[PDB]
Amino acid sequence: MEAIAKHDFSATADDELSFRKGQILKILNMEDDSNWYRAELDGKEGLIPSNYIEMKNHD
């Protein structure tokens, strides 16, 4: 699916992804279903926190 950054996030270990409020993060990982997920932004993929991605558009 698609998501949006509610707050700012700066990566610590491995390959995490940084983001800021108002930003649009893409959800395209697998079926882990947990706290770490894989996203895509500006043609780049990575891992982000599920609680750090909100929802927008649609409605």
Which range of residues forms the domain containing residue 38? Answer: 1-59
Tell me, what CATH number does 12's domain have?
2.30.30.40
Number of structural domains the chain divides into: 1
Apex 40 CA angle, 1 and 19, nearest 5: 105
> How would you write 1-59 as a 3-class SS string?
CEEEECCCECCCCCCECCECCCCEEEECCCCCCCCEEEEEECCEEEEEEHHHEECCCCC
CB-facing half-sphere around the CA of 53: CA atoms within 13 A: 22
Return the ∠ at Cα 44 (arms to 34 and 20), rounded to 5°.
70
- Distance (Å, whole) CA 8 – CA 19: 5
Phi, psi torsion values for 46, nearest 5 degrees: 170, -175
State the virtual CA torsion across 33, 38, 42, 43 in degrees, nearest 10: -120
Phi/psi of residue 57, each to 5°? Answer: 65, -165
